[model samples]
Target chain A: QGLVVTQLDVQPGECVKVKGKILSDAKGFSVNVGKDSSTLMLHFNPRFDCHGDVNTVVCNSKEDGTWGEEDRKADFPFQQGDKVEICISFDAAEVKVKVPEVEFEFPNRLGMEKIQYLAVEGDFKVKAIKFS
Target chain B: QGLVVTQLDVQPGECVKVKGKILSDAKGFSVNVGKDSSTLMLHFNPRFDCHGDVNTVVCNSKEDGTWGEEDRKADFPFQQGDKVEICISFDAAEVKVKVPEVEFEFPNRLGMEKIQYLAVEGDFKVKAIKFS
Candidate 1:
């Protein structure tokens, strides 16, 4: 299914690494971090072929259960049936995401230093998550 | 419920940190590490008052689903309803665990440098796991 981490402590300058094998029939997946599930400061959605998108990675922020303008990237490195490592780093102004071949960034619209909630949803089984 | 993390990559010398609250009705909790669910190299179990044990932490190693000798420590710092942080470091010989007021070590009987399986069970909700 999915995973939810409450009272999650991710300090600034720490890199959170999530590694999992993307499913063969994967459609999409998202890595979310924020104060709560509904109030995500960084909502990273990587779509393989769903939600009117294909092989595009979308980044956005949400508040009051509303999503902000999405930052889309067409240069995708994720492949089906392959294990992918997505690493995330945060700062005051923005958050950084790095896959195998590319790195992406998005505004930390929440302007917060730390968050206690983290959730992962959709088409893949999470293997491991580590913070360093 | 418990949390299971597979394909977990914890290289030698990496410290894994697990932080969560001890439930009010906590009977115990365990942090397990190994290659699979059936083979555990380090089984760190803390009992509040379960299975004929009280306020003690039990450490053991299991192979072929059979447990090894037990290492019991009566010096416990865990309290119900309070959040606790437990850090584990691995090496070729032993695994070191550190809590707020005490530190414990267990044999890496399997003697493996890395393992892909990690599980947390009983009496608590895992908030976050960090590696450093």
Candidate 2:
């Protein structure tokens, strides 16, 4: 259901980029980064099969073992079986994401300045991950 | 007397690389990572002006406001005014560092599994920092 990339060497003012393809029958997929497997600083989830035209992207975080508020967006820029390139960047303030043309910002609820755990979950085929 | 780069989005299974020239008049330098300005998960400090050939590199972590045990190394690979390229990598187990010809490993004292803050302190001039 999920795969984690632990011990990431990342910091602010840098970009965490992922290139992959969403499965054709994929319901959705999520990318997460934070303190551990249970705690997340940024959780970006895109649901492809939202009700009718109400495709949504949800952003949230987890502290300890509790989930925080969910920030949702209606615009969906991803397609099934299509190649995707996602870029995520953050600071003490918030996280900014870019997927093709669609972009959005979500609050950095964790308040921590850095995170080393990263994960890709749900149904997607990862091509590569780069940080710069 | 130190420079800190906040908001690093690092994760496990990746490398943090830094290139710099240690000042000729420098005494030491350090690199740190953790949750915030106070909680340091990794503190890598190398002291050049130590007693005799006992040049040491100390590694430790901080939780809340307190620090953990110090891990030290006697072998020093850096020289004054020398251009250096340092590489750091970590996992749930430990943090590994490479500077020029010498390589060392320090236990991951902070067991949070992820960290976002990255800082370089002490008397060093950084030319570049990258992660991948």
Candidate 3:
């Protein structure tokens, strides 16, 4: 995660769509949503030989710079230098990330109604980001 | 359709959700999406007893105060003074209206990209409107 406060506020009923491509020689990438760098509601990371996890998708929450339990998914539909689309939307109980092939859901552990910060980092080139 | 728009803007990828109740004695109600009163991309009207049609939902488009072909749906699930929700969204070619039971779509007339005006009138008490 970039851990910078970009003030990219995301609220319920709003969708954040990100279109990008991973670097050809990249290890992994992550999308972060939180109030500040110390706390994150969603630390959605996809690892390809990074963090000791090959072809794995890990989701976690953080509070006060401390990590929580990891929620891992079995689906890994990403490739290096491959164009990808991720759509993020929050419902009452979950934050949903729609990767190209499937929808992966993470719990809204922080109980925050609106996410005031959003960050995407790692070896990726973001072509476009749309807030709607 | 009352025809007077309040300068409400509805764009692509954005959802317009309306929550309200129909008047107890309502004859009909119309929700209009257009650039102005004279030009509506969608004039969604549900007639309870008026318009010489009972329990009918009519969808139409108008330009220069002239209406085009009418598209009628078979489902009518609205009751007087009972709370109802109408969610509107648009894709490339059509406008989608989600009533209680079904989603009704009409053609995207005028070929305008975004709808800058929206109006709802006749025997309806709107409790809330949310744009997201």
Candidate 4:
């Protein structure tokens, strides 16, 4: 329902890491990176029931509120009331993600090499986030 | 005494964040980013008792077997038996750092925009390193 936004004062060759816990009643959550609220270069989402797949992770991007295709992958490792860690990094070519049971890449379709904003939404408790 | 090396598969606009606890007998520690063991782009070091200042951080670079000048800053934040967090990011202009008590920037002297390796050395127990 609500989102926590952080200024991603990151640069190329560095990374942003996030650690958190999923709530028991959580349906889904998303982590997004871009310039602001309206545009997203990377949108990573994992749903417990969306599209009727609890084992799928979806990746996409949005430009001016218009979203691109949702690239879904199987074998999601998240669970209710479980702790989770997520790391994201990208280049001009692709965005790489690392989770407990999934390591995947999504093409950098937006062509924006640098993103200054990071947003997390859904039903989870964030423990820490670091940009180094 | 020993060093822990990790692959830094980071990219532009991402950050590398590290959290650790310094040992009671800690003297100093350094974090390095580079292509390999020979070439370093950024070297961030905090010395508890190294240059007559209990609070000093040194920044530099290395090429081959050569070392660069020690760019030092006062007001270091780490103490013996204390927990510490460091964040490092860079662009074409400079490298930025955030520690517990100090935040500073150093020039990107190496002119390298991406680093494939990361090395941590000194007396501390690392808890996490996130690249997002």
Best by TM-score: 1
Q: Provide TM-scores for the models.
A: 0.57, 0.50, 0.49, 0.51
Q: After superposition, how far is residue A118 of candidate 2 from its true place, in Å?
A: 0.3
TM-score of chain B of each: 0.95, 0.88, 0.91, 0.87
Q: Which segments of candidate 3 are over 4 A away from where they belong? A: A1-5, B1-132
Model 3 DockQ vs. reference: 0.02
In the range B1-132, model 4's lDDT, one tens digit per residue, is: 233333344555667777877889888888877776678888888888865746578888888868889787766677788988788787777877788677878887878787677667787656665554
Off by over 4 Å in 2: A50-54, B1-132
Per-chain TM-score (chain B), model 4: 0.87
Candidate 3: the clashing residue pairs are none
Q: Which model, 1 or 3, shows the larger lDDT?
A: 1
Question: Candidate 3 docking category?
Answer: incorrect
Q: Look at candidate 1 and tell me the lDDT of residue A33.
A: 86
Q: Please provide, for model 2 over B1-96, each residue's C-alpha lDDT reduced to its tens digit, 9 standing for 90 to 100.
A: 244444445677877776777889878888887776679878888878843424578878888988888778767887778888788888888888
Candidates 2 and 4: which is better by TM-score? 4
TM-scores for chain A, candidates in order?
0.95, 0.91, 0.92, 0.90
Model 2 chain B: ten consecutive residues of lowest lDDT: B1-10
**lDDT tens string, model 4, A32-98?**
8887767888898888976686756788999899999989877687887888888888888888888
The list of candidate 1 runs beyond 4 A from truth reads B1-55, B58-132
Comparing 3 and 4 by lDDT, which wins? Answer: 3
Q: What is the TM-score of chain B in candidate 1?
A: 0.95
List per-prediction Cα lDDT, in the order shown. 0.82, 0.76, 0.78, 0.74
lDDT comparing candidate 4 with the true structure: 0.74
